[PDB]
Structures are given as structure tokens and as C-alpha cells.
């Protein structure tokens, strides 16, 4: 009764956004994984019903071993969150009526997840009941048990869980932030986790990483499997890919949203 019913937040992964990109027409990184979900939604739904917003953020992951003129993973992640919650805050003040759908990939997935954690625990920026569902792809913070385990996921946890102790990483600009406090809270039943068999970001074994081997650790952390969530080669649920599934999921959620 005034403005767009439901806002869909899409957060791209590392090297798949810039602060300069169109929030409503992501264009700079055509290959961006989250575009395969957000674009189809935008054209399939009217402006009255659905607004799809993809976060324009730096989406970088500096590696000190190359001379990256990149932003550190820490701030980048930090910026991406500021940008997204402000987008969420504003749409809420303009439209206190509006419901939300949130989805993210790699870096975007840890940002999206951190947000779900907060909303789920009454920490804002929005009330729990206004979020329809969340889906995180290749979340470096994944823990088994917390959030819904969708598909042929490997049992395991994100690199930010298994490398939580490791101190150098933090000093080096990319802190492994460990488990999310209070989990996804009241959102735990609606927050979905997708992770590819062999993806070291969201399925990290102790044996995979070494301190004696830090360049290769940062490469791995910064970003085939990772490349290919839009094929049914490693993860497929009931006939579709991680992209096709999470589209279907949202397309359907938007239909069922309430009409103010």
C-alpha cells in the first residue's frame, strides 16, 4: 500500500562487484554468479511487487604476496555490509511494509550470513518476520547444524571456522571470524546453505591448509568448483543447479509474500 512489496537483496562474491555498479542493473561483472539469480527475477516481476537490489561494493580480497593494489578482505567485507544494511534500512523507512529476500555468494555469502545472524537475533536492521528466507552460496562461515543444509552438501565447515585460531591471517588483512554468535537465530529455519563438494571455502578440512604454505593459502581463500556453481557437476538438487535451485526458491518465495 504505497511502494514495492518485497525487496530482494543479492550480494555478489569477490571480484563480482564494484562500488560504482548499478544496484538495479549489475553490468560491470556479467559473469557474476548472483546475476544468474537476480537478473531473471527483475524481468520476471513487476516493480510494484518486487525490487531486486544487488550491492555495489568493492568486493576485493587483497593478497600481500602479489603487489595487489586491492582493498583488504576485512574492509571490503566491512564496506559490503555497511552498503547493504543501509540499503535495507532506507527501504524500511520508506516502506515499513516491505518484506525481504536475501542471497549471497562467497564474500557476499558471508556478508549476507552475518546480516541474517543479526536479524535473527533481534539486532536489526529489520525485524525477523519481515525476512522471507535466506540462501548463502559458498559461505566461508558455514557450520553444520546452523541453518538449513540444502542439497548434496559436504559435511564440514567454512575456512573462517577451521582457521579461526590462525593469527597471521588477521594481521595480514583477512581475519577468519569464526562461528556466528547466536547462529541465524529465529531465521534458522529459513536460512539455506549450499556448498560444493570440493570447495575449500565452505568445506575446509584441517589438512587442507598450512602456515608453512601461506601464499597458496591466500590464493585458495581469495578464490574450478568455486568457478562452477552454474553447472550440475558437483552440486545438484533434484534436477537443477545451485543457481537454478536458488532462483526457483526465490521466484516462489516472492509469489507467496504478503500484499500490503
Swiss-Prot record:
Residues shown, of full length: 71 to 334 of 337
Role according to the record: Esterase that may be involved in cell wall biosynthesis and/or maintenance. Hydrolyzes pNP-butyrate (C4).
Name of the protein in its database record: Carboxylesterase Culp6 homolog
Keywords: Cell membrane, Disulfide bond, Hydrolase, Membrane, Serine esterase, Transmembrane, Transmembrane helix
Enzyme class: hydrolase
Keyword Membrane included in the entry's annotation: yes
Activity regulation field: Inhibited by tetrahydrolipstatin (THL), a specific lipase inhibitor.
Catalytic activity, as annotated: a butanoate ester + H2O = an aliphatic alcohol + butanoate + H(+)
UniProt membrane topology term: Single-pass membrane protein
Compartmental location: Cell membrane
Statement: the UniProt record of this protein carries the keyword Transmembrane helix: yes
Top-rank lineage group of the source organism: Bacteria
Gene Ontology molecular function terms on file: carboxylic ester hydrolase activity
Family, as annotated: Belongs to the cutinase family.
Disulfide bond entries: 3-95, 195-202
Catalytic residues (positions): 106, 199, 226
Amino acid at each position: 500500500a504505497d511502494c514495492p512489496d518485497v525487496m530482494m537483496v543479492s550480494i555478489p562474491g569477490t571480484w563480482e562487484s564494484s562500488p560504482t555498479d548499478d544496484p538495479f542493473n549489475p553490468t560491470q561483472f556479467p559473469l557474476s554468479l548472483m546475476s544468474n539469480i537476480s537478473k531473471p527475477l527483475a524481468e520476471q516481476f513487476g516493480p510494484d511487487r518486487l525490487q531486486v537490489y544487488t550491492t555495489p561494493y568493492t568486493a576485493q580480497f587483497h593478497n600481500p604476496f602479489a603487489a595487489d593494489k586491492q582493498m583488504s578482505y576485512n574492509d571490503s567485507r566491512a564496506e559490503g555490509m555497511r552498503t547493504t544494511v543501509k540499503a535495507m534500512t532506507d527501504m524500511n523507512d520508506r516502506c515499513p511494509l516491505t518484506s525481504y529476500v536475501i542471497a549471497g555468494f562467497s564474500q557476499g555469502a558471508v556478508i549476507a550470513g552475518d546480516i541474517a545472524s543479526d536479524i535473527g537475533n533481534g539486532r536489526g536492521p529489520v525485524d525477523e518476520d519481515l525476512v522471507l528466507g535466506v540462501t548463502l552460496i559458498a559461505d566461508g562461515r558455514r557450520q553444520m547444524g546452523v541453518g538449513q543444509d540444502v542439497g548434496p552438501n559436504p559435511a564440514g565447515q567454512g575456512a573462517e571456522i577451521t582457521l579461526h585460531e590462525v593469527p597471521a591471517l588477521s594481521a595480514l588483512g583477512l581475519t577468519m571470524t569464526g562461528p556466528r554468535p547466536g547462529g541465524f537465530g529465529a531465521l534458522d529455519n529459513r536460512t539455506n546453505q549450499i556448498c560444493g563438494s570440493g570447495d575449500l571455502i565452505c568445506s575446509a578440512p584441517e589438512q587442507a591448509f598450512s602456515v608453512f604454505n601461506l601464499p597458496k593459502t591466500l590464493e585458495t581463500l581469495s578464490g574450478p568448483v568455486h568457478a562452477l556453481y552454474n553447472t550440475p557437476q558437483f552440486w545438484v538438487e533434484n534436477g537443477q543447479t545451485a543457481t537454478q535451485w536458488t532462483l526457483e526458491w526465490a521466484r516462489n518465495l516472492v509469489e507467496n509474500a504478503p500484499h500490503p
